[PDB]
Amino acid sequence: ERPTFYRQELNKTIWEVPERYQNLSPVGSGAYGSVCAAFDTKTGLRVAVKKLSRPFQSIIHAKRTYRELRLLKHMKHENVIGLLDVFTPARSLEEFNDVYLVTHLMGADLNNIVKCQKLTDDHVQFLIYQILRGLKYIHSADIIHRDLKPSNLAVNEDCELKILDFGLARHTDDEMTGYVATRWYRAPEIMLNWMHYNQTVDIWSVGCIMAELLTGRTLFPGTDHIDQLKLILRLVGTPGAELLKKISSESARNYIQSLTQMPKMNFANVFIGANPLAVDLLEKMLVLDSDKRITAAQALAHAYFAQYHDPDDEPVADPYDQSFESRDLLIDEWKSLTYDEVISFVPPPL
Numbered sequence: 001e002r003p004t005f006y007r008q009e010l011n012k013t014i015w016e017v018p019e020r021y022q023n024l025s026p027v028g029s030g031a032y033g034s035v036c037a038a039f040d041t042k043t044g045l046r047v048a049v050k051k052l053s054r055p056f057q058s059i060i061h062a063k064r065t066y067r068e069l070r071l072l073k074h075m076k077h078e079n080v081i082g083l084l085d086v087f088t089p090a091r092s093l094e095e096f097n098d099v100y101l102v103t104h105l106m107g108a109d110l111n112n113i114v115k116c117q118k119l120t121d122d123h124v125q126f127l128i129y130q131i132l133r134g135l136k137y138i139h140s141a142d143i144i145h146r147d148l149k150p151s152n153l154a155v156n157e158d159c160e161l162k163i164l165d166f167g168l169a170r171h172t173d174d175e176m177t178g179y180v181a182t183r184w185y186r187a188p189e190i191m192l193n194w195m196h197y198n199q200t201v202d203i204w205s206v207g208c209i210m211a212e213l214l215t216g217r218t219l220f221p222g223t224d225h226i227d228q229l230k231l232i233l234r235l236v237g238t239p240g241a242e243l244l245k246k247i248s249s250e251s252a253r254n255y256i257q258s259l260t261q262m263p264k265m266n267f268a269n270v271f272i273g274a275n276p277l278a279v280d281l282l283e284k285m286l287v288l289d290s291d292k293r294i295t296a297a298q299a300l301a302h303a304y305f306a307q308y309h310d311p312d313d314e315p316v317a318d319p320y321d322q323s324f325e326s327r328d329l330l331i332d333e334w335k336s337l338t339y340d341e342v343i344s345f346v347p348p349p350l
């Protein structure tokens with residue numbers, strides 16, 4: 001069933017892709033590999049084609065390659081990036097070395113947007129509604145994005161939004177230090193390693209994004225981890241003894257308790273002019289104790305979204321088996337798992 005491939009030197013590496021993809025032009029590179037824009041003549045879509053870099057370099061790398069593929073093959077939702085295609089030029093596992101992933105080319109992310117208009121309240125409603133719709137789906141599969149931020153949200157011209165990327169297992173300590181948007185949207189329990197985290201970290205991020213859509217300004221633009229914590233605690237208040245019990249590290253608790261206690265601030269006085277219902281939702285998202293945060297399913301039924309809420313058009317995901325995340329396998333074994341997922345790919349009927 002193999003299409004014909006053709007070769008092209010492109011960025012700095014030789015790209016070998018099926019002839020259906022035409023007019024490749026590099027758009028970005030990095031550590032993960034390299035991306036090219038192309039025209040998929042078989043579907044009429046503008047697509048991003050990513051050539052993985054060093055996919056089976058190490059056991060960690062090989063497992064991360066498999067995780068990304070499993071994750072992308074699974075996502076089938078209007079507000080989440082899906083996989084249009086995945087291919088390798090190799091004809092057998094023995095000659096398998098390269099993986100190419102094909103997705104929708106997305107132009108504008110939420111960043112490009114908060115920076116060229118004061119979103120109307122109805123714009124903010126619709127954007128956050130879609131994020132939570134995608135998050136309800138993602139979380140129903142027990143997937144945690146872990147890295148929600150404006151740059152991870154694609155928004156076309158009709159204001160339709162897609163969640164992109166997913167935190168695979170990247171984030172170096174250096175990329176998280178200082179005055180960087182890579183840390184401004186992260187829940188404090190993840191930020192400071194307080195406890196075992198769960199899907200409620202993503203709702204914290206949504207609260208930060210929503211606040212920024214409403215004000216046009218970063219909610220918690222800390223200059224470092226500790227500065228950012230003080231900004232957080234000044235808004236939401238210092239922890240009480242109940243949340244302190246749940247912080248696993250004696251040292252984090254010990255530092256926490258060094259701080260002068262502070263009451264939670266009045267959000268109506270912080271978000272001046274905002275829809276009282278937006279303020280209300282923000283108060284339920286931006287709760288220090290993650291156990292007490294609103295969930296995505298609960299937030300969709302919040303009155304702030306009455307315009308868009310449709311309980312019969314907020315689907316959940318098929319089961320997603322992540323047992324592989326606990327397996328220790330050799331490089332060759334992850335690679336073979338990945339090859340099986342490549343050759344079993346079924347294009348979307350879309």
Ligand SMILES: *c1c(OC)c(OC)cc2nc(NC(=O)c3csc(COc4ccc(F)cc4)n3)sc12
Nearest residue numbers: 108113117119120122123124127155156157158159
């Ligand atoms: C929403 C939005 O996010 C809250 C942003 O930020 C990216 C911009 C934005 N612009 C909008 N304006 C229109 O959608 C518009 C202009 S004319 C029209 C009716 O007909 C058309 C014309 C061209 C098209 F491609 C589609 C429809 N709609 S909404 C919004």
